[PDB]
């Protein structure tokens, strides 16, 4: 499978969306599976996912990973109210637009608080919630905050350069020496292409601060059976809060991966597959 | 299968122990896991782990449940030493005995503590280490200790009643429904079956205060790959003692079940199965 | 100074009270400061806090121990709300009918969740908040709950005996040897005295849970310079609360003792009197 | 009081000390504090301890900052061995050389693992002990380490300049608006003026890294009256260690200041004066 052959768009119309264009990369025919991104600069469905859209494909599922408003191929916006809340409404906008009753979310960081802000919002059309380090559940009981990678995240955003993104993926990956050219080049030219995505993001930071996406409050409403995973290194969302939700969450669990910085998905992808995969069979 | 039909015995020589007998309950004939049961009054083999001995052996395992030194139907003895070292010296006479090489460990509490000993006493012989709920590990950083289900293992062993067996059970599981009058008899008869055994934990414990079974500093010893599995709500050895272990073992990672106690292998048996038998085969 | 030498009573008419009897213990004549107690059988203003009025008073402030609603020499009330907003309307009530414009407010367990609500509600009649492990604030991200002396407290409501109440002090407190005949028959006295407060509690209990009590989502609202104090090692609020609080209120600071239980102001009256004073005087 | 006019030099012969010479800065004339600075560039006593010196030689102690060896004033040293027990041996080579027989001591970070070393290695010269976020404790159980400012204390001493050294106390200092041109100049002159210091800091860190300054497992044989203090928004020790502490040491408490980074005596100098004073008197 390849990024070309597996890219999409779909035009959207949920709430304040009008004819917005959502870029996505599917393969596969079985239950669906929508995969959500992180935030940093760069970002996108099929660079944060390409090591697990085949493994879940060969599984039998429909993989989409979607590009969230104002990241890579998806239309530019600027956002006044907190990321997870507008996502997860772009989330729905895509299902109906391509005819899908029900999906399974796979989300990282401000992608896990759009899978947590949908399973809210939309319990109707939600199978399986699926989490690593999701953000947006307020403060930590030990890390002071904003996080190391928060920080990096908004530098990034800022003042761009090749040099800041290295030194933010040395701050997101335990491994340093996964950090190859190839990673760093396809970072580079998602930021590269799309400049307007920066300034936005920056714009939409101050009209709804970070502060402002906490739905700790309403964990409780959340029917879904829950995976939460986490990164023990993680410098970017803190680990004491997947115990914040599988004290919340009603039918929860928590898997935490040793040498793991914020992409569990990618840093441990073999066993980060095997277990979600299972999980989607049999939990 | 059945307690009876897998019932066996084995003499055993390793160090302070001569021709010492030694109850396990064996079937399968793959790859050896040998698991471990927890030190309460009336623990063993056979009732901790039969909800997993079929689905490991249908996995393809030699499963061995064995009863420690002093519990069940193995000799009785009062110990000197820490529990968890002098349960490994059985463990590794037991396979001597038996002419096996290496072994998988699964410990709960006590057996944990005994997993992890034997893997530090004989890295040679071990293949991988599934950790549930480890004791020895010294002082919480959250809990305060003794733990609530620890005085009640004490409060059994000295005054030994259905009453106090009960008001036990209640707390190490965290659906109070799964305490049938099956599961209570059980353990009752175990009790009523061997006192010799009560009264014999107590005078170990004297010599040898739970103080000091602690193997934190020599947590970086251990090369095994590592799973460990705690329940949320085990109130007889704390959750943070999960994270101590993650972040000293080379190579770990961490699970925890919600809506469980200090039996995740039995009150969350089939994840539990399908967990660490993924785990043994592919990690 | 004496029970019986500051025993004072006076009727309260705050929203659903009225001419409801409230039982303090008052002595000096500075700046106020009222003292609230814990929800366990018996409890009460002046057994809670006899080992602070004195050298309180003597570093010169008003003290008022206060008997929340349906405790010791308060009228007996059956509450609907979670208990310490209703505690909270008390203690305005018995401001306004003492002609008290503000007061500090020094609060364990339920009377720390009664000062919680009671800054929340009425920010305009308190000066400085201090809490020594307030009840209230939702799940612990470490302990299994009902924690261990919840579980005791109710016990104790529902079949009160001499020996419970031995057992569930055994749990409160964390030097053993500090449970004397004088402290547990005081404390059976109160309860023998009052029954009718017991089967209220419970019914009270019943109508709003505990789960009802959480004020976490508001903590931010509070602009009271906050002390918070917990003993390491009490079992009947969890200790992380403690960072729950420092995290989330603006001007907050955490003292934690070692070897102290759910009574701090009791089991290290010297040094706690000695931090409080200094923090009203100096902070 | 002054830098210049409290400024003093002693030299020392203990261990592998010959006429090793040690910068300090006394006033008072009452039993002795010595106060222990942190290990980044720049770092010596007076410059940590400014806001405290005055206070505390108020109160009636004799007040002792201390360069440890290779920081600031005191001789240039390779060091071959854990840091904090080298500088332990410094303060007892001081100590023998004043003709002090016992000291209370203070320190934050690396200090705070001097003076734990020193409270190992010499029990019988030792009073109080006083800790604010000290080093050396081995793995946080959740952050991930090496720390932040610790990366960027690394980074100083590599590439010194005064970019990276406002960076590093960006880090330090919770509220940011504290870091003067005053502050930053007079870190950059003891950078500036001794660039061995720099060069043999990162020789000696390669020599015993920090994880051999964990001291964890000897805790519970010291005796001294413990104090331990952190900013919750530390950034360079983690809080989780404070938990540790009070949980290992025999007679500790725990204060943890809200809005304070790794200087504590400096960002919450007069609570902090306070508290330690009391404690140095009542305790
Ligand atoms: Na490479
Ligand atoms: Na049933
Ligand atoms: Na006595
Ligand atoms: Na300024």
Not at 203 to 225: F, M, N, Y
Not at 244 to 264: E, M, P, Q, T, Y
Request: aromatic share 10%; with cysteine.
């Amino acid at each position: 499978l390849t990024e070309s052959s597996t890219s999409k768009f779909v035009k959207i119309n949920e709430k304040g969306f009008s004819d917005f264009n959502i870029h996505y990369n599917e393969a596969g025919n079985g239950e669906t599976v929508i995969m959500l991104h992180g935030g940093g600069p760069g970002a996108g469905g099929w660079s944060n996912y390409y090591r697990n859209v085949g493994p879940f494909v060969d599984a039998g599922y429909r993989v989409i990973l979607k590009d969230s408003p104002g990241f890579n191929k998806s239309d530019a916006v600027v956002m006044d109210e907190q990321r997870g809340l507008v996502n997860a409404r772009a989330v729905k906008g895509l299902m109906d637009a391509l005819d899908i009753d029900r999906a399974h979310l796979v989300g990282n960081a401000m992608g896990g608080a759009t899978a947590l802000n949908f399973a809210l919002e939309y319990p109707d059309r939600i199978g399986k919630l699926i989490l690593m380090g999701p953000g947006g559940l307020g403060p930590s009981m030990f890390a002071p905050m904003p996080m190391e990678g928060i920080k990096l995240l908004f530098k990034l955003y800022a003042e761009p350069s090749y040099e800041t993104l290295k030194q933010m993926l040395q701050v997101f990956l335990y491994d340093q020496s996964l950090i190859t050219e190839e990673l760093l080049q396809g970072r580079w030219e998602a930021i590269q292409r799309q400049p307007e995505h920066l300034k936005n993001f920056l714009i939409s930071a101050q009209k709804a601060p970070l502060s402002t996406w906490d739905v700790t409050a309403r964990l409780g409403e959340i029917k879904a059976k829950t995976f939460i995973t986490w990164g023990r290194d993680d410098r970017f969302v803190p680990l004491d809060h997947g115990l914040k939700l599988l004290w919340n969450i009603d039918d929860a669990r928590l898997h935490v991966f040793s040498k793991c910085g914020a992409w569990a998905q990618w840093e441990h992808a073999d066993e980060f597959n095997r277990l979600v995969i299972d999980f989607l069979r049999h939990a």
